[PDB]
């Protein structure tokens, strides 16, 4: 799995279920899975049929190698600095219309805060997730 | 198991009496045994890189894998058969075998796929059945 | 018999629709929409026309209440504006 | 589930009585929500485009209380809601002072409003509610709509980084079963 | 130059009539008077209702730059439904033929449009296909309006924060029972009766033994035709 090239591959296979062509919405899942974000202007600026080849080029063309999960840290220098209580933080999650179920969010908690602390901050979620890849 | 073949296959690829794990796999695959990286890493922690005939026999016993069958080996292929036909394309099958574990190379996988059947659409069950013989 | 067969059939299609489109465990935060029959005056008006014009007057009574009567009391109770809202209500015609 | 009734018609079976009670129930259902009004005007009876008939329109200007809705300018405040409904809508502006244990809800509002640059003129914090001027509410929703976007992608990034881990963990279980396919293929390559 | 009626210096009866006169005739029917919104019936499609406009109000950031419309309201209603998590209600008010039923459809079409294409539109399919059936079965031609609603329609809809209807509940009340049996002159019965006795296939014309639109006692034989209405083409759309 060495560098990113072989790690982007493993991902495409999964999100398409080893399909030559991936689903449009599943490609949006796939880009999110590497800390890549787009505007409606760039979102419309995407092909009809999406293959593996394009994805690899796209990943190189996008994915910030310095900070992969910058969009987690982008929530200014007060919210990222302050700790959010486990339950109150999940309130924000469910409110922002999350797709993750009870188990999925528990899985996430088991990855983010594995010491089972009374509270959790954002700069920590990103740091764990960069070591997750 | 053939006692005559074991002694013959050892002497054929031995160096200064001892044998390298790499030769011991080739010799196991000559008998009809399938040693994997898990079988290799177990024998390596014990007697280093080079092993004598006695240490070599205890290696061939791990290569046996009696619990092996079609239903046991298809588990990864079945995880990717969402259409529920019992069939995967040669393209689909090749990527599975290249990405994870004892990562076979593209042409190692491609040739092994054609050696089974000329057809693109391959039944993973009949395939395991064939390669296990 | 013809009246009841048509009305129950029209409402059976509504039930068949609601059987497939309704959420299990009801609604939590839903979006209401109200399309009624608007004020209609002909040369000859009957009970049909009476029930329609009643609906319109009802929708108005609740409009005037929410938009004016309630807002006037809200601003006053919060301690913002003691000022009165001047408006015409159907209070009398709705009661008759 | 229709009541098979025989003899004299009951008060609950009478069309008008059955109509008013259905209407009555519907109105309360609407009173419990936050209504929005669309006031449609029919300009002429001839059913013709670009044809203005001042009488017919004027009656409708009264009957929909369009001219009467003008006195609502006197109020001067566009946004008006309790501390709770406000603080849930505008928590993203600064979750920090938003979920403060020491600071009270009346004062949390003040902080997040002043955080968004607003001055004591654009708002007037009432008895149980927070009021904002049309000018004031524009500022707050502009800042909130930049921050909603910040967390909208922030969540969607976490969403998939776990959805990825889902497919990953469900694949790791099949991996030893696959290693055996890969060891039996090498075995077959030795024979040929 | 401006959308809100309350921005005039003199807000007297004629001054408001003229402000609305010049807006309607220059084909700008929607005029605010916050919280109220005035929609004058243009009687011709201005194209301001099409998908292009839906997408505008949907994906446009500043609400200030956008002109008054049924979609301005549809977005601000959905902005509170998810913003504060409070149930909201839309109310189309006006006389017979003011544009209530049509405006409902436009605001329904707005909620039908989703930003991200990853939704189960199977539920949203039946929801939208119900309306041309509800107008065939519940709406009839009158002297006031040719698509006059003889029934009261009420909906409850769970809409996504990006768009698209997840679930719904169409609750119809008070159907004009008399319209089925007797109809006045130049006034027509429920559209579906005329639609079925014009657009039915040769198989249903023999199995049910269907006769001409004039041959029925429950149907006004002289009012049978409606201007600009093809009950055959409407029936095709009704069946699907
Ligand atoms: N925005 C509009 N553009 C064009 N015609 C319209 C518009 N709104 C309404 N109409 C016309 O008015 C007629 C009646 O509208 P409708 O919504 O059914 O009113 P109501 O609920 O009062 O019966 C429609 O059939 C249509 O021809
Ligand atoms: O307003 V209506 O014409 O639907 O009665
Ligand atoms: Mg109508």
Residue numbers in the entry:
A (entry chain F): 2 to 134
B (entry chain D): 72 to 204
C (entry chain A): 435 to 530
D (entry chain A): 627 to 818
E (entry chain A): 98 to 337
Source paper text:
We determined the crystal structures of FL PfMyoA with two light chains bound (PfMyoA/PfELC/MTIP-Δn) in the post-rigor (PfMyoA•FL-PR) and in the pre-powerstroke (PfMyoA•FL-PPS) states at 2.5 Å and 3.9 Å resolution, respectively. In the PPS states, crystallized with ADP and Pi analogs, however, the converter orientation is less primed by ~30° in the MD structure compared with that found in the FL structure. SAXS experiments validated that the PPS of PfMyoA adopts the more primed orientation in solution. We describe below the converter/PfELC interface (interface A) seen in the PfMyoA•FL-PPS crystal structure, which is similar to the solution structure. In PfMyoA, a more rigid interface forms because it involves mainly hydrophobic contributions from the α5*, α5’*, and α6 helices whose conformations are stabilized by W777. Conformational changes at the end of the SH1 helix are required to allow an additional Converter rotation so that it can reach the PfMyoA motor domain surface with which it interacts. These interactions involve two interfaces: interactions of PfELC with Loop-1 and the β-bulge and a specific interface between the Converter and the N-terminal subdomain (N-term). We conclude that the priming seen in the PfMyoA•FL-PPS crystal structure is stable, and that the PfMyoA lever arm is more rigid than in conventional myosins.
The core of the glideosome consists of an atypical class XIV myosin A (PfMyoA) and a divergent actin (PfAct1). PfMyoA is a short myosin with a conserved globular motor domain and a lever arm that binds two light chains: an essential light chain (PfELC) and myosin tail interacting protein (MTIP). PfMyoA is a critical molecule in the parasite life-cycle because it powers the fast motility (~2 µm.s−1) required during motile sporozoite stages, and is essential for providing the force (up to 40 pN) needed for non-motile merozoites to invade erythrocytes. Here, we present the X-ray structures of full-length (FL) PfMyoA complexed to PfELC and MTIP in two states of the motor cycle.
